[PDB]
């Protein structure tokens, strides 16, 4: 029952028990692997055994299981769902869950650094106003000058009898995506439906490739109020190259701040319908697909053509030519703007590091191979050559249906 | 919608269903609990129920299914089976269960030619100096003076208390590797223990970082004979720049031919121990796994200094751009050599032609996304983006465990 798992570089073996305790399936059967697949195809006595299995892990994790304590979180959990149908989280458990559903992510490979985490309780949240002053509180304090901090921020559980707390945004930050007459899009083509939304509900576009969107936020059972990010609190770096000085014609530029917005986190059966978190990004993610996927801003043949390359045929390899100069130059400006960033070289060394830590403490690690490795030189880092088990665990963060 | 897994692509938005999934008769090591696709590695009756299908396979492909001869020919398995316990394929049942075998390899990204399969039948050979003409005709057939032409031999099935035929060499070609007493190795550390294995058997040892293995052949119950490869018969390309011109000082090369020896072919439960088998190179095989892995050439380093790159830092992409150079010199110098290759892009293209023809004549395809996927600028690859479905077909290429 548990897979023998091989470092193909180093010779190395381990053991996977930490998958034992994993009660949510994923889409693979013996039949067929599904895990390429981006999304899945997707209570009284049973919110109450999640309840139960979360409680203890928090007290495990404080080292006081069995004690006294312990034991009256019990009987407050199971009068509270005996009563209502549901119960409420101690601060400072949902502050041990955030941190723990970081640590589970299969998907991140930024988690070396999940033990630090700063968790903003935000769960007195009555209005769509209110969410915009903490989800700006969450900006200041995540983007600190370009000296970026790991932050949650943790609107109130949905509940049985109405609509989620909810962010329409994917992203805090987002460029709009302009849907042109010959049906090219300016702006950001992942952000055409959310563009439009914005639009819908009132508000004003410009004519950019890199304006910043509004926020649509939600409250229960409300029409979502549309709210301007202050261009102050969202920080920007411009692109250029260290040797091309052409780079910087080109108007390119990205946002410091990777905030997911759109993400359910799950904990002891509670559901958090909106829970931004941030940290800082690793450079493919802007370098590569942001600006290289051809359905994104497709930006290497503009490149690749100003590097005099030589266009014709796929040989000559300017495709991988210009993938590196764009991925040198977002690192480049983000270092000298002096706003935190990180390499792929740098953030898989660090995540061979975490399998190693969650080896010993835990007994494996859950990991998505195909998300791990980056999207440029997969096999020139070590990620590549490192066998991985994909499994669920809880607490979570989890995809969730978009609100319209 | 259907009942079978849903497939996307991220690039175009394009959705198809897998039926051909349906077909699998085997389980791979995944299940609902835990995905183990990244993991490199995992008569009775049976036999009976194996061929039958295999044979309805055959039938279905000629188009007389249901026919007399489709119905004469299981008449016949059954009784070949009923009075010996095994049964003998005809010719073209043979020239199609190896197609098929390739067209069922899911993590092979060449399958656009799995039609073009030139098949040597070598099912009367009954010694170690026959393997051995057969695998030159294979190899100077295959070479075709660098005009290379995929190819399959065929050496006889199993049979129930005598020993295979095996090719203990894992590709027909291989570069020796040396073990150092200061523990290093000088050419290629792969090939360590077949190296030890033929200096065992009585070859003298050579001491480059190139030397040509002989073949370690093994004729049913005897201990393996040892052969020499003609000089002439193994064509090799020496590695060069098209503008760094130092690159050619590096004295670097790499053989024409791939050609994997240690696979089982498996038929209708029908084993064949020994059929290798060859194509031509993707150039990201050899610039980048061959020459850039650690455990294998690690030529990164040298080629970088020589390129004059900051080295000691992983932000100036000092990997990333030496990759891509040596990549260069790979297409190139088997361009200017008249020696058959492709290119990460122009065959990863082509598989997408591939999915797509099966899609219409099968309704899927198994497909190993890790595998697919190149080891360089995968994003930048439209494979990167497709999701794919890998489950076990037969016909089938299958790992077996080495004769020593
Ligand atoms: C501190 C710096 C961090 C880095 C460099 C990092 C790195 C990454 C990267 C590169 C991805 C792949 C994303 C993509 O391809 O678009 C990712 C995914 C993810 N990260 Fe992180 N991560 C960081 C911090 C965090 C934090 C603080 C959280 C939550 C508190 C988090 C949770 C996640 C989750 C849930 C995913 C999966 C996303 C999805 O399925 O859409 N990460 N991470
Ligand atoms: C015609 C040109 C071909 C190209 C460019 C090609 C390309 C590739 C590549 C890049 C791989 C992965 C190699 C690696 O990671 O080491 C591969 C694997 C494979 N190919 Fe091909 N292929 C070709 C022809 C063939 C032929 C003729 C056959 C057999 C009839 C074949 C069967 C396989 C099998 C079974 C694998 C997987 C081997 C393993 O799992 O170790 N391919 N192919
Ligand atoms: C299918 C899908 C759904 C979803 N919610 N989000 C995505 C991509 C989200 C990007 C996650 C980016 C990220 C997040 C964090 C926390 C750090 C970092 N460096 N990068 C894809
Ligand atoms: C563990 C292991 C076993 C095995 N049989 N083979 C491998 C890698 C073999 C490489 C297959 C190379 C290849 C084969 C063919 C036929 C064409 C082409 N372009 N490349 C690993
Ligand atoms: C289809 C495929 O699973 C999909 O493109 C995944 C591949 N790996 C990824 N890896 C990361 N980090 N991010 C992604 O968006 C993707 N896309
Ligand atoms: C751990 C991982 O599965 C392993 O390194 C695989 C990844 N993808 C690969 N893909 C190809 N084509 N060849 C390989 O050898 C590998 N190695
Ligand atoms: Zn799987």
Redesign the interface.
């Known amino acids: 029952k548990f897979?023998?798992?091989?470092n193909?570089?180093?010779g190395s073996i381990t053991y996977?028990t930490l998958?034992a305790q994993?009660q949510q399936?994923?889409p693979?059967?013996?039949?067929?692997?599904?895990?390429?697949?981006?999304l899945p195809?997707k209570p009284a006595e049973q919110l109450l055994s999640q309840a139960r299995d979360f409680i203890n892990q928090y007290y495990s994790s404080i080292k006081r299981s069995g004690s006294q304590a312990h034991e009256e979180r019990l009987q407050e959990v199971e009068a509270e769902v005996a009563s209502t149908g549901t119960y409420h989280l101690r601060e400072s458990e949902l502050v041990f869950g955030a941190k723990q559903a970081w640590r589970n992510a299969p998907r991140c490979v930024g988690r070396i650094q999940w033990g630090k985490l700063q968790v903003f309780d935000a769960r007195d949240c009555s209005s769509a106003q209110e969410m915009f002053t903490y989800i700006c509180n969450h900006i200041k304090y995540a983007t600190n000058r370009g000296n970026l901090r790991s932050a949650i921020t943790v609107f109130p559980q949905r509940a049985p009898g109405r609509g989620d707390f909810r962010i329409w945004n994917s992203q805090l930050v987002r460029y709009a995506g302009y849907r042109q007459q010959d049906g090219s899009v300016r702006g950001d083509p992942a952000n055409v439906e959310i563009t439009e939304l914005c639009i819908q509900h009132g508000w004003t576009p410009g004519n950019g490739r890199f304006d910043v969107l509004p926020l649509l936020l939600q409250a229960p059972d409300e029409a979502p109020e549309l709210f301007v990010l202050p261009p102050e609190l969202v920080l920007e770096v411009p692109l250029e190259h260290p040797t091309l000085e052409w780079f910087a014609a080109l108007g390119l530029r990205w946002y410091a701040l990777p905030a997911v917005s759109n993400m359910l986190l799950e904990i002891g059966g509670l559901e958090f319908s909106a829970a931004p978190f941030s940290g800082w990004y690793m450079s493919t993610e802007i370098g590569?697909?942001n600006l290289?996927?051809?359905?994104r801003y497709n930006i290497?043949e503009d490149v690749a053509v100003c590097m005099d390359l030589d266009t014709r045929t796929?040989?000559?390899?300017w495709?991988?030519?210009a993938?590196?100069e764009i991925?040198?130059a977002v690192?480049h400006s983000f270092?000298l703007a002096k706003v935190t960033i990180v390499?792929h070289?740098?953030a898989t060394?660090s995540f061979m590091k975490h399998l190693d830590n969650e080896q010993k403490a835990r007994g494996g690690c859950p990991a998505?191979?195909?998300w791990i490795?980056?999207?440029?030189?997969?096999?020139?880092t070590p990620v590549?050559?490192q066998?991985?088990?994909?499994?669920i665990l809880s607490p979570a963060f989890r995809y969730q249906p978009d609100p319209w």
């Open positions: 897979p023998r798992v091989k193909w570089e180093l996977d998958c994993s399936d994923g693979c059967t013996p039949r067929r692997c599904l895990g390429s697949l981006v195809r590569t697909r290289c996927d051809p359905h290497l796929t040989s000559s390899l495709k991988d030519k993938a590196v991925n040198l690192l270092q390499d070289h740098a060394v998505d191979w195909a490795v980056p999207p440029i030189s997969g096999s020139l590549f050559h066998e991985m088990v994909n499994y």
